[PDB]
Amino acid sequence: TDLKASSLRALKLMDLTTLNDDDTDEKVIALCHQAKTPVGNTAAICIYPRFIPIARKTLKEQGTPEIRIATVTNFPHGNDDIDIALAETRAAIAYGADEVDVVFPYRALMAGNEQVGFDLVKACKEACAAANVLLKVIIETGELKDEALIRKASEISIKAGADFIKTSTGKVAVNATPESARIMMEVIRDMGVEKTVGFKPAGGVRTAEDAQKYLAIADELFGADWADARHYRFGASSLLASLLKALGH
Amino acid sequence: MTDLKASSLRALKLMDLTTLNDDDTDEKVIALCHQAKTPVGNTAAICIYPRFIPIARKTLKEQGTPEIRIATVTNFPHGNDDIDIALAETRAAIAYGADEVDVVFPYRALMAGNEQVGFDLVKACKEACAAANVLLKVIIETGELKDEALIRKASEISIKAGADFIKTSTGKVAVNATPESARIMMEVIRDMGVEKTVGFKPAGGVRTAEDAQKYLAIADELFGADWADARHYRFGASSLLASLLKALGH
Numbered sequence: 194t195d196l197k198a199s200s201l202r203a204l205k206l207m208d209l210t211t212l213n214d215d216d217t218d219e220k221v222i223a224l225c226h227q228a229k230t231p232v233g234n235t236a237a238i239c240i241y242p243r244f245i246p247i248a249r250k251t252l253k254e255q256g257t258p259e260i261r262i263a264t265v266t267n268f269p270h271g272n273d274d275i276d277i278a279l280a281e282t283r284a285a286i287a288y289g290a291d292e293v294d295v296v297f298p299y300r301a302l303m304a305g306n307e308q309v310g311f312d313l314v315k316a317c318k319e320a321c322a323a324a325n326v327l328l329k330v331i332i333e334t335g336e337l338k339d340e341a342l343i344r345k346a347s348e349i350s351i352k353a354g355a356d357f358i359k360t361s362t363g364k365v366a367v368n369a370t371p372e373s374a375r376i377m378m379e380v381i382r383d384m385g386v387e388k389t390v391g392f393k394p395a396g397g398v399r400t401a402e403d404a405q406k407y408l409a410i411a412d413e414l415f416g417a418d419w420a421d422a423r424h425y426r427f428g429a430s431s432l433l434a435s436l437l438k439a440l441g442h
Numbered sequence: 443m444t445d446l447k448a449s450s451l452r453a454l455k456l457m458d459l460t461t462l463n464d465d466d467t468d469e470k471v472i473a474l475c476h477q478a479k480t481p482v483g484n485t486a487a488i489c490i491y492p493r494f495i496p497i498a499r500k501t502l503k504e505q506g507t508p509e510i511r512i513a514t515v516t517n518f519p520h521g522n523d524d525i526d527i528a529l530a531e532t533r534a535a536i537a538y539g540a541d542e543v544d545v546v547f548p549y550r551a552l553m554a555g556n557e558q559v560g561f562d563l564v565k566a567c568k569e570a571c572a573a574a575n576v577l578l579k580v581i582i583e584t585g586e587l588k589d590e591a592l593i594r595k596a597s598e599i600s601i602k603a604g605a606d607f608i609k610t611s612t613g614k615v616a617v618n619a620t621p622e623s624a625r626i627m628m629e630v631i632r633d634m635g636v637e638k639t640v641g642f643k644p645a646g647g648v649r650t651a652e653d654a655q656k657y658l659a660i661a662d663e664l665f666g667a668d669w670a671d672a673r674h675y676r677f678g679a680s681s682l683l684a685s686l687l688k689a690l691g692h
Contacts, residue, residue: 241493245530246527280495280538281496287533289530
């Protein structure tokens with residue numbers, strides 16, 4: 194019953210995603226239908242900005258307007274041009290995004306520049322906050338690699354106003370891992386910002402067994418009631434099929 | 443010849459150098475920006491999908507051609523009749539930094555008998571663009587409208603709704619720009635007397651210097667040789683550029 198319990202919980206915390214070079218309106222429409230499962234709705238969908246308008250219409254017409262729409266900006270590169278990252282974020286807001294997952298300029302941080310990351314996140318947060326849009330920040334743990342760098346990127350993002358810190362883009366060699374997730378959640382804990390900052394493991398999370406492990410870390414650090422939609426999301430795709438299977442669907 | 447060479451340079455400077463492919467990337471757009479800066483002059487603009495505007499702007503600036511405009515497309519290529527969606531995409535295009543937005547008119551709705559939605563859609567998008575000092579071109583998709591009466595009607599509605607340019611096609615259907623469609627649309631501009639405020643843009647399938655010459659000849663005939671400047675005429679094309687340069691000995 195433990196795996197079934199965690200699987201249903203994980204399903205309801207999913208940011209059902211599709212960020213492929215071959216994405217089409219038709220594929221996103223299908224994703225919206227998938228988000229409305231036989232056992233409940235996912236927390237949201239995560240798609241490229243251009244698909245937001247049609248996705249919003251699709252979710253509304255099937256009676257699931259509560260399924261949030263997240264998107265990505267400064268993605269997947271995480272370049273350090275704040276003007277470009279901000280323009281993309283403002284465009285995402287204009288398209289109608291409920292949430293924007295922006296990529297932190299991690300290569301700049303690896304090069305010893307902590308200021309550009311703070312300013313980039315802050316600028317995007319200011320834009321999102323003014324539009325009642327939540328901002329998640331992707332630090333790309335797989336590329337940062339070192340615990341110190343993962344902690345630093347998390348810390349900077351939090352100080353700059355991140356509403357969520359996310360592990361990866363799903364576009365690099367290594368993405369979410371239990372180890373990286375624990376480090377990032379430890380930062381939220383050490384900074385005492387668990388009430389205002391959520392966590393989102395993303396990329397490579399494909400099985401119900403994996404999801405259970407990620408939620409176990411959250412429960413361990415913040416108590417079993419902490420991981421609600423405002424504080425936890427699963428950036429995944431095929432994971433949904435695995436969760437549904439564990440639930441007999 | 444001499445006339446052909448002259449029309450080719452003129453057409454080059456009026457080109458909205460385009461790339462709107464499913465396999466487009468930042469790299470391909472950067473290459474497009476480089477192509478827009480030719481040895482005999484710069485194209486009037488580039489036309490790309492909204493998401494590529496920021497990097498395109500940076501690329502044009504770094505190569506010393508900030509005067510090359512950036513046009514994009516919305517409600518594309520479908521021309522659906524949902525005004526909220528068309529408007530949202532247009533506002534996003536503006537936010538990305540577009541100088542011009544080429545929106546697709548709800549042509550199937552018009553064909554089904556709805557003249558009002560086209561007026562309302564263009565008007566809503568024009569309002570957003572004008573508020574940001576962005577020009578709005580309206581694609582009526584002549585290849586699908588097919589009939590002369592429908593082409594004139596879509597052009598008239600678009601103009602009344604505030605179009606800054608009327609454009610023939612998306613380039614995503616079989617039949618796009620044709621000399622006949624261009625003449626019909628320009629005749630509407632002439633008949634309505636809006637040549638000072640409304641430009642024309644033949645788009646799709648315009649591949650040769652010879653073709654470009656014919657399209658410009660129609661404009662010169664109807665409005666005089668000095669009418670077709672960047673604010674009033676553009677070529678929505680891609681491979682055309684190579685043909686124009688070849689005609690010029692480049």
